[PDB]
Amino acid sequence: STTTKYIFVPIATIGCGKTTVFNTLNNLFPQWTHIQNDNISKKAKLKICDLTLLALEDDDQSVVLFDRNNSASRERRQIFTTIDQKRDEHLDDTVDLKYIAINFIPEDLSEEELWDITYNRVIQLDENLVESVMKGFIQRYQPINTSRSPDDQFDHVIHLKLSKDENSLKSSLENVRIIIDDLVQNFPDLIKEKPADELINECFQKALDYK
Ligand SMILES: Nc1nc2c(ncn2[C@@H]2O[C@H](COP(=O)(O)OP(=O)(O)O)[C@@H](O)[C@H]2O)c(=O)[nH]1
Numbered sequence: 526s527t528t529t530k531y532i533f534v535p536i537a538t539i540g541c542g543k544t545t546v547f548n549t550l551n552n553l554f555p556q557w558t559h560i561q562n563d564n565i566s567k568k569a570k571l572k573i574c575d576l577t578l579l580a581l582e583d584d585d586q587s588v589v590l591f592d593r594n595n596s597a598s599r600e601r602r603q604i605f606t607t608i609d610q611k612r613d614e615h616l617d618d619t620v621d622l623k624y625i626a627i628n629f630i631p632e633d634l635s636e637e638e639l640w641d642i643t644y645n646r647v648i649q650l651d652e653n654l655v656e657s658v659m660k661g662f663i664q665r666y667q668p669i670n671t672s673r674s675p676d677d678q679f680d681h682v683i684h685l686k687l688s689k690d691e692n693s694l695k696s697s698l699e700n701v702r703i704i705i706d707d708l709v710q711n712f713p714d715l716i717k718e719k720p721a722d723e724l725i726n727e728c729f730q731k732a733l734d735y736k
């Protein structure tokens with residue numbers, strides 16, 4: 526009849542834990558599709574928006590974890606505009622697409638704290654290179670604003686934490702739990718009942734200790 530598919534869109538900078546969070550989710554939900562912009566050649570014929578629509582063709586596949594920073598508003602605009610104009614190449618008219626923003630940078634977080642947390646995660650000439658690339662994404666960062674274009678096209682926003690780890694609880698593991706609880710409440714057809722907490726912890730351990 527009618528199928529609902531989902532595209533999870535981060536708003537993040539480097540080192541906020543996007544890949545760790547998305548890998549944890551995909552370990553829990555192997556049927557979801559994790560597309561990593563960092564794995565795509567900057568001269569690939571099919572770019573991330575193309576691979577996203579390619580994935581959503583199968584009745585198999587209903588979730589794309591769109592793994593890219595999108596720190597700048599123009600990068601969110603690209604997603605909405607490109608998917609909107611190309612989806613009829615791939616999907617029939619019975620497929621409803623929903624866009625879920627995954628906000629990695631709390632609105633009250635200072636740029637200083639954002640830098641301290643992410644820079645220490647990433648380091649822990651090539652150092653200068655990593656640092657200046659990280660500074661570029663932060664320089665371009667425009668916080669999510671659903672009161673105006675383009676972020677008003679999101680169907681839903683999940684607000685994550687970004688903290689120093691406290692009480693031996695990794696920030697990204699807390700965020701995995703936040704996402705699961707939010708989806709169970711707001712999109713109950715997607716995940717029917719929550720995975721066991723020990724399974725979430727193991728799936729996060731796998732992602733965290735990925736080298
Ligand atoms: N201490 C700590 N490290 C984390 C956390 N989340 C991710 N990391 C680590 O921080 C680094 C960057 O995480 P990653 O998921 O690759 O960030 P990305 O650039 O947004 O994809 C990796 O070495 C992760 O293992 C966290 O909550 N706490």
Ligand SMILES: [Mg+2]
Pocket residue numbers: 543544545563
């Ligand atoms: Mg990454």
